[PDB]
Amino acid sequence: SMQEEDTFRELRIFLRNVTHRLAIDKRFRVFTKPVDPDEVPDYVTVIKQPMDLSSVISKIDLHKYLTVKDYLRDIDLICSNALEYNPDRDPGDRLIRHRACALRDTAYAIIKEELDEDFEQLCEEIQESR
Ligand SMILES: COc1cc(Br)ccc1CC(=O)O
Ligand SMILES: COc1cc(Br)ccc1CC(=O)O
Ligand SMILES: [Cl-]
């Protein structure tokens, strides 16, 4: 239906706003772009599913997210990718891990306060019946 179309547009709008709010945050600057295979060539080998805020945007835009659940699954990636790739004791790694996982926590905290549960549930049911 159109109803259902209006639901997904709303989701897309909501997800864009959340994503923008992470993107304008100085802490998260490094997550706004994919990793350049210059600086880091061994990345694209170790990290199977690269993920970042600009990709998240592309995916919103290409109607690739039908639920917030799916969105968060990508946000989880950004954190767990950093855990995986930058595991060392050194401060360069500790900082990246810290920033990536605060991104995750900020995303979750925003959604926990601003996402209507019934809206999520609706997206889930529409998606399930497709
Ligand atoms: C600096 O603004 C952004 C940067 C990235 Br990466 C994604 C999204 C936005 C804003 C928007 O999509 O509304
Ligand atoms: C971040 O936690 C959630 C994530 C999703 Br998806 C749906 C609901 C919640 C808790 C809430 O929205 O009350
Ligand atoms: Cl820095």
Cα 32 to ligand 2 centre (Å): 24
Expressed in Å, this structure's resolution amounts to: 2.5
**Experiment used for this model:** X-ray
Choose the residue to mutate in 11, 112, 114, 124 for probing ligand 2, maximizing ligand atoms within 8 Å of C-beta. Answer: 112
The Cα–Cα gap between 25 and 41 comes to: 26
- Residue owning the nearest CA to atom 6 of ligand 1: 54
Cα 79 to ligand 1 centre (Å): 19
Q: Domain ranges in the chain?
A: 1-130
When the candidates are 1.20.920.10, 3.10.450.50, 3.50.50.60, 1.10.10.10, the CATH number that belongs to 1-130 is 1.20.920.10
Instruction: From residue 116, give the alpha-carbon distance in Å to each of 41, 76, 77.
Output: 41, 20, 24
Q: Could you tell me if the CB of 68 is within 6 A of ligand 2?
A: yes
List of residues 6+ apart from 35 with CB closer than 8 A: 43, 44, 47, 50, 52
Looking at all shown ligands, the one closest to residue 30's CA atom is: 3
b/e burial code for range 8-25 (CB count within 10 A of at least 16 → b): beebbebbeebbeebbeb
DSSP the chain: ---HHHHHHHHHHHHHHHHHHHHT-GGGGGGSSPPPTTT-SSHHHH-SS---HHHHHHHHHTT--SSHHHHHHHHHHHHHHHHHH--SSSHHHHHHHHHHHHHHHHHHHHHHHHS-HHHHHHHHHHHHT-
Angle in degrees, CA 127, 51, 118, rounded to 5: 30
Looking at all shown ligands, the one closest to residue 98's CA atom is: 3
CB 116 within 8 A of CB 11: no
